[PDB]
Design a protein around this nucleic acid. Structure first.
Lengths: 199, 117, 286, 286
DNA sequence: CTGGAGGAGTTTTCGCCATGCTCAGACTGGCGAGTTCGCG
C-alpha cells in the first residue's frame, strides 16, 4: 500500500525489515512510516476514467489502520475504533467537518468532476487557517440550493451538524505537525462512515 | 466552548452582529426566496466597511414592522444590537484570512444561542 | 568555448498590477504566499521558463542555440540522437563503459543546447548521458510588503455538456493582486563555466533576456508586469573578494515621502545603492 | 610535519533561507528534524564533504594535498599503490610482518593525503593498510529554534520515457525551510596530531576553509546559506585547563528584544560572549 | 657447554544449494418566542 505505485518492486528495505522486527518483538515502529503513508495520501489523484464508475478512495482501510497503530504505539495517544461524538480535539474536529462539507457539495451538484477533495485536501490539512473560509463561504451556496427545493430534501440536518461540531472550536490553527495531520485523517475517515449508515 | 460574551475580538463581534441581523430579517418577512446571507455573506466578511452601512438600514426597516404590531419580541433585537456595538470602535476596511475565519466562528457561535430554549 | 573569468552577483526588481503572477496548484489557484507573514513568492522555474521562451523566440533555432525543446517533447529520443551522432550504441541504463566516448556524448549535448550549457540538467534515464550542474543559479523572489489578494466573481452565457438547467447558465471565479513589488537574487560561477564552456556572448544574451523578459508574455490572467531595475556586481578575480550577503545589503528599498498608505505605483518607493568594497565593481546602468 | 602543541575548541554559526540544507534519504526528501521537538539537524558528514571540496578546488591537486575519498573512485586500487611505492607484496586481508613494518605504508599514505591526515579513515579491506583516528572531530549541528518546513508543487511540460498512456504533462514537488539558524561544535587534540604530523599551516588552511566554505556550493536546492560567526578557544598547554562544556556556555544566543513573531533574518537575534578563565584565551575576529 | 623439553607461538585441515496472485457499497435527515431610563 505504501509503494509509489501499488507494486512490490518499490518497497523500501528499511520498512520491510523494521515492520517485521517490531511485529515479532513489540518495539517501536520505524519513524519513517508516517511520512511515507502521508506522501502517498497527498500525492494520489484518481479520476473517473477508472473502470469502477465511482471514483477511487485514497483514505483506504489499510492506511487508516496503519496510522492508528503508529499513533497508539509510538506517540502514546488514544484513538477509538469508530466515530466518537465527544472527542473535542481540534484536528479531529476539523477532519469531521471536512466530511460534512463534501457531503453537502456532492448533493448540491450531482456528478461534478472536481470536488473540494480534489483541490483542497493537502493545503487544508497543512494550513487550515488559509483555506477554510472559502470552503465555509461556498457551503452557503451549496445549502441554499437545497432549501429552495420543493421537498427541502437534508438542509436543516447538515446545518445542525455544522453548528454542533463548530461549538467546540475557538480558532483555526496556522500550522500543524505530522501527528496532527494523522488525527485529521482519522477524523475524516470516521465521520465519512457515520453517514451512509442509517439504512 | 460556546458563545463568550466577553471576548471583544472585533471580527468575533462582527460575526455575531451578522447573525442577529439575519435573524431579525427572517422574523420580519417569513418565507423569503432570497436572504441577506445569500446576497452579502461573501462581501461582508472581506470588506466590512462597504456593506454594513447598508445592512443597518434594512435592520431598522424590518424592526419597524414588528414594533408596529402587538408582537413584542420588538425591542429585544435593539437591546442586543446596543450590547454588541458597544464594544466596537470602527469598521475595518479590509481583513486577513485568519480574521475571516474568526468572523465565521463568531457567526456560528452566535447563531446556535438564538435557538436555545 | 572560452569561459568567463570572474564571479558575478546581481539583483532584479519587477512589479505587477491587477493580475496573478504565479498560481498555486495545491490551493485552488491562489497566488503563492508565505503562510506566516503574507509575503508573496514566485518560483525561479517560472523565470527560467520565461528566459527560455525569449531565447527561442529571438534566435529561432540557430546553430548551437537549440533550446532543448520542452513543449511536448520526449527526452530519451533526444539522448539517442547524441548516442547515434557519436556512433555509440546506448546501454540499457548506463553510460558507455569507456571513458573517452562516455564524455563525448555529454560534450555534444553541452555544445548544441544553450539551456543545458547555462542551467544544466539530469540525464541519467534509461539512455544515459550524465549530469550537469549549471553555472547560473537563482533564488525565490519575495515581495517587500504583505499583499492582499482579491477574489472576483464571473458569469457565462452557455454550458459545456448535457446539464438540465432548462438564460444565465454558469458562474466562475478569479484571484488578482492589486499591486506588489518583488526582488530576486542570483549568482554566476567561473569554475563551472570553465567546464561547460559558458562564454561571454552568452552572458550578453542573458542580460538582454533579463531586460526584455515580460514583453512577450502577455496573457488573460497575467495583467501588466514589467522590470524596473538591474544591478550587477563584478569581482576582480576568479574567486570572490567579499561575502555575497554583504553585497546584497548595499541595496535598500523603502517608501517615498508621500507614503499615503496603500502603494499603487512604482513612484511610492525609493531605491538606493551604497558603495562597494574596493575589490568589487558595481555597475547599475543596465 | 611538526605537530601543533595546544588544545583547541571552536564554535560556528551559519544561516539558511528558502532552501533545503540537508535532505533526508528516507522521508522522501524532507529536511532532517527531531520528531519530538521540531528542531532541525545537519549531519557532520555533510560539512566534511564541503571542506574536502574547498581544499580540492583551492589547491588543485598540489603534491601532498590529494584527497582520498574522491568522486566515484575504487579504494582498493589506492591501497595497492602504497605497497607498490614501498615495494613489498600485499596479502589478502593482512598486513606485512614487521620485517618491512607496515608503518612504511602507513606513513606513505598519511604523508600525502590531506583528508586522511586530518580526519582519519578505515582501511582494513581485502588489501589491508591499517586504521587512523584523526585529530579533528565535530558533532551534529542543531537549530536554536524549531523550524517549520513547507512543501511546494511544480509542473513540467515534457515527458521522459514513452508514457504512451497520454506528449503531455508531469508534476513533482519540493520542500524548503523559510529561515533557520544553526550551531556547531568541534575539537582538536595534540597527542593524536603528533601521530600524523598535523601542522600549523594545515590549521590555517582549515580556518580559511571554514570561513569561505559555502561560497562555492550554490545549487538549485540550497537557496542562500552563509556563515556568520566563529570563536576559537586556545589552551595554554598540551592538555587543557578547563572542561569543554564550561567554555561552550560562554556563548549565548537570544532573540532581539524588539523582534516579535517568527524570525526571518539574522537581525532578529543577539549574540554575546562571556569572559574566559585564566588558562584559556578567546580569539574571535575570524 | 651441551642437552631435553615444556611452554609459547604459528600453520593446516576440517566441508562446503532451495520457499508461493486474487476480489466491492451504503443516505436522503424540519432549531424558538424577548423589555430601556426620568427637575429644579
Amino acid at each position: 500500500q505504501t509503494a509509489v505505485l501499488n507494486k512490490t518492486e518499490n518497497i523500501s528495505p528499511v520498512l520491510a525489515g523494521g515492520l517485521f522486527r517490531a511485529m515479532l518483538t513489540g518495539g517501536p515502529y520505524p519513524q519513517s512510516l508516517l511520512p511515507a503513508v502521508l506522501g502517498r495520501i497527498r500525492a494520489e489523484h484518481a479520476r473517473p476514467e477508472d473502470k469502477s464508475r465511482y471514483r477511487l478512495e485514497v483514505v483506504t482501510y489499510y492506511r487508516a489502520a496503519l496510522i492508528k497503530a503508529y499513533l497508539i504505539r509510538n506517540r502514546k495517544l488514544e484513538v477509538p475504533v469508530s466515530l466518537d461524538p465527544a472527542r473535542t480535539d481540534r484536528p479531529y474536529l476539523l477532519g469531521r467537518l471536512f466530511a460534512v462539507l463534501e457531503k453537502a457539495q456532492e448533493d448540491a451538484v450531482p456528478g461534478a468532476n472536481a470536488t473540494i477533495k480534489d483541490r483542497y485536501l493537502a493545503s487544508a490539512s497543512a494550513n487550515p487557517g488559509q483555506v477554510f473560509h472559502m470552503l465555509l463561504k461556498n457551503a452557503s451556496n451549496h445549502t441554499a440550493k437545497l432549501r429552495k427545493d420543493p421537498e427541502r430534501k437534508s438542509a436543516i440536518h447538515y446545518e445542525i451538524m455544522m453548528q454542533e461540531i463548530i461549538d467546540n472550536i475557538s480558532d483555526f490553527p496556522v500550522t500543524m505537525s505530522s501527528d496532527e495531520q494523522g488525527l485529521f485523517m482519522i477524523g475524516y475517515y470516521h465521520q465519512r462512515k457515520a453517514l451512509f449508515t442509517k439504512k | 466552548v460556546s458563545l463568550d460574551p466577553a471576548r471583544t475580538d472585533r471580527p468575533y463581534l462582527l460575526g455575531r452582529l451578522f447573525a442577529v441581523l439575519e435573524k431579525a430579517q427572517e422574523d420580519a418577512v417569513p418565507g423569503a426566496n432570497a436572504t441577506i446571507k445569500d446576497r452579502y455573506l461573501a462581501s461582508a466578511s472581506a470588506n466590512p466597511g462597504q456593506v454594513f452601512h447598508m445592512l443597518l438600514k434594512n435592520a431598522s426597516n424590518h424592526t419597524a414592522k414588528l414594533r408596529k404590531d402587538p408582537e413584542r419580541k420588538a425591542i429585544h433585537y435593539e437591546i442586543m444590537m446596543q450590547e454588541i456595538i458597544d464594544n466596537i470602535s470602527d469598521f475595518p476596511v479590509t481583513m486577513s484570512s485568519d480574521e475571516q475565519g474568526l468572523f465565521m466562528i463568531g457567526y456560528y457561535h452566535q447563531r446556535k444561542a438564538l435557538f436555545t430554549k | 568555448m572560452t569561459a568567463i573569468a570572474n564571479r558575478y552577483e546581481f539583483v532584479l526588481l519587477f512589479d505587477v498590477e491587477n493580475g496573478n503572477p504565479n498560481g498555486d496548484p495545491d490551493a485552488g489557484n491562489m497566488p503563492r504566499i508565505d503562510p506566516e507573514t503574507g509575503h508573496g513568492l514566485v518560483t525561479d522555474v517560472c523565470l527560467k521558463r520565461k528566459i527560455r521562451n525569449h531565447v527561442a523566440l529571438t534566435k529561432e533555432g540557430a546553430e548551437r542555440f537549440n533550446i532543448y525543446i520542452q513543449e511536448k517533447a520526449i527526452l530519451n529520443e533526444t539522448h539517442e540522437r547524441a548516442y547515434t551522432a557519436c556512433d555509440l550504441k546506448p546501454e540499457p541504463k548506463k553510460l558507455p563503459k569507456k571513458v573517452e566516448d562516455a564524455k563525448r556524448v555529454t560534450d555534444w549535448m553541452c555544445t548544441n543546447f544553450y539551456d543545458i550549457r547555462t542551467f544544466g540538467a539530469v540525464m541519467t534515464t534509461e539512455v544515459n548521458c550524465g549530469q550537469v550542474r549549471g553555472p547560473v543559479q537563482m533564488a525565490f523572489a519575495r515581495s517587500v510588503e504583505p499583499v492582499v489578494p482579491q477574489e472576483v466573481s464571473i458569469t457565462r452565457m452557455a454550458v459545456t455538456t448535457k446539464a438540465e438547467a432548462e438564460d444565465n447558465r454558469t458562474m466562475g471565479r478569479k484571484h488578482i493582486v492589486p499591486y506588489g513589488l518583488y526582488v530576486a537574487h542570483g549568482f554566476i560561477s567561473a569554475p563551472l563555466a570553465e567546464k561547460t564552456g559558458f562564454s561571454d556572448e552568452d552572458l550578453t544574451l542573458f542580460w538582454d533576456a533579463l531586460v526584455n523578459m515580460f514583453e512577450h508574455d502577455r496573457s488573460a490572467a497575467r495583467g501588466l508586469m514589467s522590470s524596473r531595475k538591474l544591478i550587477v556586481f563584478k569581482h576582480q578575480n576568479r574567486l570572490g573578494n567579499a561575502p555575497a550577503h554583504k553585497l546584497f545589503d548595499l541595496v535598500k528599498v523603502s517608501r517615498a515621502e508621500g507614503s499615503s498608505g496603500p502603494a499603487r505605483s512604482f513612484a511610492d518607493y525609493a531605491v538606493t545603492v551604497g558603495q562597494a568594497p574596493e575589490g568589487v565593481e558595481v555597475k547599475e546602468m543596465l
